[PDB]
Write a protein that binds this DNA or RNA. Structure first.
Ligand SMILES: [Mg+2]
Ligand SMILES: [Mg+2]
Ligand SMILES: [Mg+2]
Ligand SMILES: [Mg+2]
Ligand SMILES: [Mg+2]
Ligand SMILES: [Mg+2]
Ligand SMILES: [Mg+2]
Ligand SMILES: [Mg+2]
Ligand SMILES: [Mg+2]
Ligand SMILES: [Mg+2]
Ligand SMILES: [Mg+2]
Ligand SMILES: [Mg+2]
Ligand SMILES: [Mg+2]
Ligand SMILES: [Mg+2]
Ligand SMILES: [Mg+2]
Ligand SMILES: [Mg+2]
Ligand SMILES: [Mg+2]
Ligand SMILES: [Mg+2]
Ligand SMILES: [Mg+2]
Ligand SMILES: [Mg+2]
Ligand SMILES: [Mg+2]
Ligand SMILES: [Mg+2]
Ligand SMILES: [Mg+2]
Ligand SMILES: [Mg+2]
Ligand SMILES: [Mg+2]
Ligand SMILES: [Mg+2]
Ligand SMILES: [Mg+2]
Ligand SMILES: [Mg+2]
Ligand SMILES: [Mg+2]
Ligand SMILES: [Mg+2]
Ligand SMILES: [Mg+2]
Ligand SMILES: [Mg+2]
Ligand SMILES: [Mg+2]
Ligand SMILES: [Mg+2]
Ligand SMILES: [Mg+2]
Ligand SMILES: [Mg+2]
Ligand SMILES: [Mg+2]
Ligand SMILES: [Mg+2]
Ligand SMILES: [Mg+2]
Ligand SMILES: [Mg+2]
Ligand SMILES: [Mg+2]
Ligand SMILES: [Mg+2]
Ligand SMILES: [Zn+2]
Ligand SMILES: [Zn+2]
Lengths: 53, 71, 96, 53, 168
RNA sequence: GACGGAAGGGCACCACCAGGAGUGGAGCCUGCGGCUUAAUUUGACUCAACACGGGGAAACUCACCAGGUCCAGACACAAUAAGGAUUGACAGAUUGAGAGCUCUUUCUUGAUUUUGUGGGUGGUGGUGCAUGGCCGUUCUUAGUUGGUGGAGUGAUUUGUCUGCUUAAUUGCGAUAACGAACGAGACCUUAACCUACUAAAUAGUGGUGCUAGCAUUUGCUGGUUAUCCACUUCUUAGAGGGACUAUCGGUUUCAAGCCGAUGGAAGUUUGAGGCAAUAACAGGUCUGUGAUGCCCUUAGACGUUCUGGGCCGCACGCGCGCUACACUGACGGAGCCAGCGAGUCUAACCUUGGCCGAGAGGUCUUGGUAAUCUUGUGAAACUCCGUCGUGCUGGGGAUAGAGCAUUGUAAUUAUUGCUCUUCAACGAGGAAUUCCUAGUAAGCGCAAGUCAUCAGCUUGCGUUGAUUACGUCCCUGCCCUUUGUACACA
């Protein structure tokens, strides 16, 4: 019962959100992980990304 | 910045006034009851709802928007 | 929250027989897993329950992992009018 | 490397190394039901595919 | 199904990273120390490695029965394809994850910052460790934040054995 | 302790010499200031602000501006209330609007609610001068503290050093200090080497069949996927091997070490990175966070949502970059050479091949969830053969007009691609200033990140590949002692 209140959100930055804190800035679309770049570093050791070089 | 020095713009909400809705009938003695404001042919609400006749148009309040019944 | 009696009775029936109700924090969805009602009708139903006890709430990565407590067993028993000696979820089937 | 925009522009890299093997074994189906329940290991995917047709 | 290995193995790491914080927040009062996952067909095994498993088990299997339901009802597993195993960790005082949770509960009860730090350094160095340090940052009877270094032992800070011999 | 236009020693091309390509000059892209604006959201200001916030903003993102909705104000208490406490709605009016938002109106819905108090919740609201975390920087230079014993009444000092040697508090040694803990080194990752090992139709070659063309005396160059076998030289990477300044000749009193030659894939710490102490900053971020104290706001909302506009406005100043000022070049054919990569499930990603079209592209199908297909990414600079002949020219493609298409609900302030036309400034850039020592500088393009579409950005990679130092402390600046001080906010 809501013709209003909706907008096309199939593309762009507002189409999706980070699965950590719903942030729209600095998000990673690569490899299907959808982690923002500030929270990716705190959980990089948990995923398996390490610093060799 | 946001002190809101705009004009009056008097707006309010709805009312939903509690008038005597079910005081509109035509009851006789011994023993029949003749119901005014005849119903609709809606197959979802079977013989329970009524219709409001305003001006050459009878509207169903149970259904939401568009069901045209005339008399 | 103002919601009809058909939507609320589908929540507490599913809450008692399962114990765990999850709901991702995402609105204008209205169709989600294993519950016919909207995503908004699930979250604000149990958020009304948190301030009187009866349930435990953890946030968990925008997904709202909920946990029924032992005090909410008596409240849903009176609400659904289910008889006693039937407590689903707590008793294990065979060993573990 | 920084969450804000202040500081020297230091970049940070990560890597995850994926190793993959495949072994062809002309085996009867009796030892197939044994080799799947044995040699289990976390983080290891075991795939059994249909023959050449 | 049908996920490439450059994305499925990444999503398995997201699966481990998502369960790291939830089993930290939920099992905070039970001495959480980290988990490991073992995927096998017809039965997926997730080992819950904590310090105190009776509180995780609860009264005759009520809390651990809910923890299996918290996983499979959102992650779209079938009922009966996931079993969470509780396991008591060995040599408590060697893992810094459970000792970091011990710092939080002492400060919420009203214990002093000097006694809560000294109680753990005396516990770790007598548990069989080579060295330990406790760094507390923030305000300590002040309007301005300070920092203290409660170090005791043999600690190196650079190189590859930092990635192997210390937990932070 | 800091600082000296104080001395001694040592080091650095974020320092200079010998040079290289530059920037600053011109147009343009972008960031900042200023001006303007309903708003031109707001942080950051020497190195350590300024192609920064991964910030390539059409909606969204966004916090700004002009307006309209929604409660998603938990719960507790009290009150009103089943004779309805409040929800929904057509048409018309109204509104940007097929928001009942409100109104004309009378059906609907049923205590889930409304009003008030109390209390929560939300906020890209304020405060980074309340903070956590993370990073930057002081230090990319070798520094950094305890145990015990000495010196001093003490603050403190010795150890932690005269000399010599290194990238180094490296060591040889010397000694009221002796033994240790950090950093450096070690370690780890990657690029180089192994005709040896275990192996490969998802990586290649040789041979045997079939078959096409050229010479025909045996050949040569190709094609063909379970025909048929062998091999692992390349390519992939499991376990390993391998330089250790080895050997030798000089040099310092021997010793740590340096220099030269030979051998060797490799003798600058093998090349390049990752990690990186103590103490400190009123460095940056409350606009990464459901990390957070306090304050403000909490419904005609500094919550949230929709429509439209802005972040792109502009006499002007600055910063990072791009294309050029050509004949070592433009232009037209032709030669044709890579690596790091990345790609679609309950969907619409990377695209081969065949047709249509000048192009942009469109259409019909197929391979690949990937060493398999795109892909040998047969990319550019380059190389050949021609035209051009010095004339703001055929160098330069800014500005401006018209049209054809793609992305998207939507492109006007032209998203972007393509075709025609417009064809300006710029004739080697003043004072100043940046980066760099070998497969580096520079030239060149590709991939990835942000991405529905768009880099002229950035992170990686490959191709072509110099000149000139192998030093010094002159300038800027950093370490170690000695000394001076009326500085300690140094
Ligand atoms: Mg919108
Ligand atoms: Mg107000
Ligand atoms: Mg060390
Ligand atoms: Mg090191
Ligand atoms: Mg020179
Ligand atoms: Mg632009
Ligand atoms: Mg600009
Ligand atoms: Mg501006
Ligand atoms: Mg403002
Ligand atoms: Mg601010
Ligand atoms: Mg400053
Ligand atoms: Mg500096
Ligand atoms: Mg840039
Ligand atoms: Mg703002
Ligand atoms: Mg009327
Ligand atoms: Mg600060
Ligand atoms: Mg800080
Ligand atoms: Mg002493
Ligand atoms: Mg000294
Ligand atoms: Mg000393
Ligand atoms: Mg090594
Ligand atoms: Mg080989
Ligand atoms: Mg340091
Ligand atoms: Mg900041
Ligand atoms: Mg931002
Ligand atoms: Mg933050
Ligand atoms: Mg009002
Ligand atoms: Mg008012
Ligand atoms: Mg009012
Ligand atoms: Mg509108
Ligand atoms: Mg706009
Ligand atoms: Mg010419
Ligand atoms: Mg040419
Ligand atoms: Mg060629
Ligand atoms: Mg396909
Ligand atoms: Mg390959
Ligand atoms: Mg080629
Ligand atoms: Mg050529
Ligand atoms: Mg300058
Ligand atoms: Mg490119
Ligand atoms: Mg791109
Ligand atoms: Mg030098
Ligand atoms: Zn996040
Ligand atoms: Zn009806």
């Amino acid at each position: 019962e809501n013709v209003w209140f909706s907008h096309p959100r199939r593309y762009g930055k507002g189409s999706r959100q980070c699965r950590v804190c719903s942030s729209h800035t600095g998000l990673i679309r690569k490899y299907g992980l959808n982690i923002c770049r500030q929270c990716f570093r705190e959980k990089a050791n948990d995923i398996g990304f390490n610093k060799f070089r | 910045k946001k002190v809101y020095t705009t004009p009056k713009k008097i707006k309010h909400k709805h009312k939903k006034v509690k008038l005597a809705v079910l005081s509109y009938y035509k009851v006789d003695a011994e023993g029949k009851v003749t119901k005014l404001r005849r119903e609709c042919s809606n197959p979802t609400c079977g013989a329970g709802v009524f219709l409001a006749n305003h001006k050459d148009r009878l509207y169903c309040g149970k259904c939401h928007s568009v069901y045209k019944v005339n008399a | 929250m103002l919601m009809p009696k058909e939507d609320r009775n589908k929540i507490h029936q599913y809450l008692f027989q399962e114990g765990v109700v999850v709901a991702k924090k995402d609105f204008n969805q209205a169709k989600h897993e294993e519950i016919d009602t909207k995503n908004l009708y699930v979250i604000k139903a149990l958020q009304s329950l948190t301030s009187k006890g009866y349930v435990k709430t953890q946030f968990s990565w925008q997904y709202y992992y909920y946990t029924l407590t032992e005090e909410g067993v008596e409240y849903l028993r009176e609400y659904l009018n289910l008889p006693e000696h039937i407590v689903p979820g707590t008793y294990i089937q065979e060993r573990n | 490397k920084t969450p804000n925009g202040e500081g020297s522009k230091t970049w940070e890299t990560y890597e995850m190394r994926i190793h993959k093997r495949y072994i062809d074994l002309e085996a009867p189906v009796q030892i197939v039901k044994r080799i799947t329940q044995i040699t289990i290991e976390p983080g290891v995917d075991v795939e059994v595919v249909v023959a050449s047709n | 199904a049908l996920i490439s290995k450059k994305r499925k193995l990444v999503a398995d790491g997201v699966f481990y990273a998502e369960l790291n914080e939830f089993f930290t927040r939920e099992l905070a009062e039970e001495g959480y120390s980290g988990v490991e996952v073992r995927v096998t067909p017809t039965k997926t095994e997730v080992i819950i490695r904590a310090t105190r498993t009776q509180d995780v088990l609860g009264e005759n299997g009520r809390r651990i029965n809910e923890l299996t339901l918290l996983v499979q009802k959102r992650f779209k597993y079938a009922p009966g394809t996931i079993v969470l195993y509780a396991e008591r960790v060995q040599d408590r005082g060697l893992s810094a994850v459970a000792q970091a949770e011990s710092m939080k509960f002492k400060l919420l009860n009203g214990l002093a910052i000097r006694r809560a730090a000294y109680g753990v350094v005396r516990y770790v160095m007598e548990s069989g460790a080579k060295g330990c340090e406790v760094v507390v940052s923030g305000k300590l009877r002040a309007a301005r934040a300070k920092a203290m270094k409660f170090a005791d032992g043999f600690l190196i800070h650079s190189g590859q054995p930092v990635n192997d011999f210390i937990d932070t």
